[PDB]
């Protein structure tokens, strides 16, 4: 009653006490600061190695840290570990759940993970002493569909699900250690910071939350989107990140500034972004629309430098290699193309 | 040396052999999404085909079907429903003997039909609990007109075949419900996908064959659409 009304006004006044601080720290803008920077111009990139062999739609992929091997997942219970240089299918892991929505390649390359509507992030050991690869273990305990599971170390994995929770696990014993709560919507994507001491998470509530891995607290929350956030990725330096939502725009938020710096919106574009990945320098942003093509944005001018028009369906998953050599791009046409 | 190259090239050939064998079984199995609500009766539908996410495996005339009951997830669908944009069909189950929650089923139908990703998937609509509908209509305590004001202005369609020795009040109740789902289906349907409504009870010795017959029809019409015949 009176007590509940006091809490609503007390919490709302804090938002009023933050928004004035946010607008106060807006003396300049990214758009006018970089008005004189030499434009990127036109970025033309053509397909180099189209990878074929997925029966069903490709839902997600991940690059190895060696910038050579990538792993892809498709809705037919197949994890194929591709060799990008030579187009050679190193492994084709058969999955118990034909419905997988994410996959991550470990930085050591010893393991790979995947999860989806099975509600479990399975870990597959690629250095088994025997011929084939098996299931290392099952990380059961989540309630919703696993939307994104990236790797911290060989023994720490961070997962986000449809139950509005990001979880950090321990593969050695398969029990959840730290649970991140605070989202009011399905969580769709993560991003690990380059220092791995933080990670930002975008959910289906137009809010991206920065989390602290070792503490298990959401230290800061970024709002300014209008619809579900479908992908998120840090800036290469780890001092900023960018998001893609269903309202057909991409927004770059600054961690230190605390507000959105610049939005990447076009009048012709009315399709939700499905995947975002920065270039190695951070000067380009690559956004994979479900308008059947990817657009290479000037990350300090909001100018479409170029378009990667080569897909016959929704662009599912997009990634850039660590060295920034080339850009893979899965899709729902079951074909994972590599651009450069 | 190029000795390692030969080993990689033969492992790719071994992989490709297994992928071809997995392609044959993947195309020979029809995947179905089994939607519905808390009281819909998908539980008793899967008991007929028994002969987190849950899969039901059955065959009719030596044709394998996969049915997925997505049960483990939350009440928000807008992001896990996009996974099933490749399924042969949606098996949608509705409780025809609960008029209060019947409007919920119509809104869910509308969102599925008009989805940017599912606008090509046909629906095998199942109106379960027809037995409970018979007794409720003859009870007279609950009125369709209480929930649906256009039931008063509705007549039993000419192209309707009542069951042997059936009360005609029930037939007019049944076919008003059916027409409510079909009314949505035809408003935006552009031949990309079709609805296949059916009247089933909890005691049917069927709905394995009905799905098989409707699945073959869905597969027939995509061929003709490719041929520009339809």
């Amino acid at each position: 009653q009176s007590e509940l009304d006091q809490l609503r006004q007390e919490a709302e006044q804090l938002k009023n006490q933050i928004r004035d601080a946010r607008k106060a720290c807006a003396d300049a803008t990214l758009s006018q600061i970089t008005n004189n920077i030499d434009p990127v111009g036109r970025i033309q990139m053509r397909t180099r190695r189209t990878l074929r062999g997925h029966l069903a739609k490709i839902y997600a992929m991940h690059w190895g840290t060696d910038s050579r091997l990538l792993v892809s997942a498709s809705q037919d219970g197949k994890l194929i570990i591709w060799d990008s240089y030579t187009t050679n299918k190193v492994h084709a892991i058969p999955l118990r759940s034909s419905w997988v929505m994410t996959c991550a390649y470990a930085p050591s390359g010893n393991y790979v993970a995947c999860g989806g509507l099975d509600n479990i992030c399975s870990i597959y050991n690629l250095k088994t002493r025997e011929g084939n690869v098996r299931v290392s273990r099952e990380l059961a305990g989540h309630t919703g569909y696993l939307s994104c599971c990236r790797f911290l170390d060989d023994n720490q994995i961070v997962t986000s699900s449809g139950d509005t929770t990001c979880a950090l696990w321990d593969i050695e014993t398969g029990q959840q250690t730290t649970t991140f709560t605070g989202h009011t919507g399905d969580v769709m994507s993560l991003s690990l910071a380059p220092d791995t001491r933080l990670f930002v998470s975008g959910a289906c509530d137009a809010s991206a939350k920065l989390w602290d891995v070792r503490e298990g607290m959401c230290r800061q929350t970024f709002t300014g989107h209008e619809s579900d956030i479908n992908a998120i990725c840090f800036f290469p330096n780890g001092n900023a990140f960018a998001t893609g939502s269903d309202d057909a725009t991409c927004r770059l938020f600054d961690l230190r500034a605390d507000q959105e710096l610049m939005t990447y919106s076009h009048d012709n574009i009315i399709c939700g972004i499905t995947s975002v990945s920065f270039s190695k320098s951070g000067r380009l942003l690559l956004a994979g629309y479900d308008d059947f093509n990817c657009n290479v944005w000037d990350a300090l001018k909001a100018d479409r430098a170029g378009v990667l028009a080569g897909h016959d369906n929704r662009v599912s998953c997009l990634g850039v290699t660590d060295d920034g050599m080339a850009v893979a791009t899965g899709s729902w046409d079951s074909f994972l193309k590599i651009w450069n | 040396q190029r000795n390692e190259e030969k080993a990689q090239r033969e492992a790719n050939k071994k992989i490709e052999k297994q992928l071809q064998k997995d392609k044959q079984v993947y195309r020979a199995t029809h995947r179905l999404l089994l939607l519905g609500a808390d009281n819909s009766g998908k539980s008793t539908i899967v008991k007929q085909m028994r002969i987190g996410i849950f899969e039901t495996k059955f065959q009719v005339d030596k044709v394998n079907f996969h049915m997925f009951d997505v049960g483990g997830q939350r009440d928000e669908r807008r992001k896990w429903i996009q996974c099933f944009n490749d399924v042969t069909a949606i098996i949608f189950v509705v409780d025809s003997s609960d008029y209060n929650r019947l409007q919920e089923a119509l809104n869910l139908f509308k969102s599925i039909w008009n989805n940017r990703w599912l606008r090509t998937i046909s629906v095998i609509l199942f109106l379960n609990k027809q037995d409970l509908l018979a007794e409720k209509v003859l009870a007279g305590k609950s009125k369709i007109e209480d929930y649906f004001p256009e039931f008063a202005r509705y007549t039993t369609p000419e192209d309707a075949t009542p069951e042997p020795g059936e009360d005609p009040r029930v037939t007019r109740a049944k076919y008003f419900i059916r027409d409510e789902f079909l009314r949505i289906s035809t408003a935006s349907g552009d031949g990309r996908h079709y609805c296949y409504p059916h009247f089933t009870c909890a005691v049917d010795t069927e709905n394995a064959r009905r799905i098989f017959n409707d699945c073959r029809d869905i597969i027939q019409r995509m061929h003709l659409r490719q041929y520009e015949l339809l």
Partner: nanobody
Framework: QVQLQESGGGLVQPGGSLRLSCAASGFTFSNYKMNWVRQAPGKGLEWVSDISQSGASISYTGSVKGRFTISRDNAKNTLYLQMNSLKPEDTAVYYC?????????????????????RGQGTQVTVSS
């Protein structure tokens, strides 16, 4: 920030009239289809009505059909629900739900328990 604040709602005699105003902020009101959903005491959320971007396509739940009137004003970013007659059965809290994706006809999860894009809502009470 996507915020939806609802006005009106209050004690009313049966067969009276009341107007609900939903003010939208932090998004282009012009693109998202809107909705009205009500939660009766000890009962799940029910869908009441929806309105398209241009107001052309309007529907209703049937239990309120031709008695509730829904209108939107893209100029002021305001969504209305004109209640003409007030049956005692419609005693519930009214939320001003917004469809998730902008340029789509489909409107999933507006009646979910924990939906993100649904306002706080105002309790509408009808009694003698």
């Amino acid at each position: 920030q996507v915020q939806l604040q609802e006005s009106g709602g209050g004690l009313v005699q049966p067969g009276g009239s009341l107007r609900l105003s939903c003010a939208a902020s932090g998004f282009t009101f012009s693109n998202y289809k809107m909705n009205w959903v009500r939660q009766a005491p000890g009962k799940g959320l029910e869908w009441v009505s929806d309105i398209s971007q241009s107001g052309a396509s309007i529907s209703y739940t049937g239990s309120v059909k031709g008695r509730f009137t829904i209108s939107r004003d893209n100029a002021k970013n305001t969504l209305y629900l004109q209640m003409n007659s007030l049956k005692p059965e419609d005693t519930a809290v009214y939320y001003c739900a917004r469809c998730p994706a902008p340029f789509t006809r489909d409107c999933f999860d507006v009646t979910s328990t924990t939906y993100a894009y649904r306002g706080q809502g105002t309790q509408v009470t009808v009694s003698s």
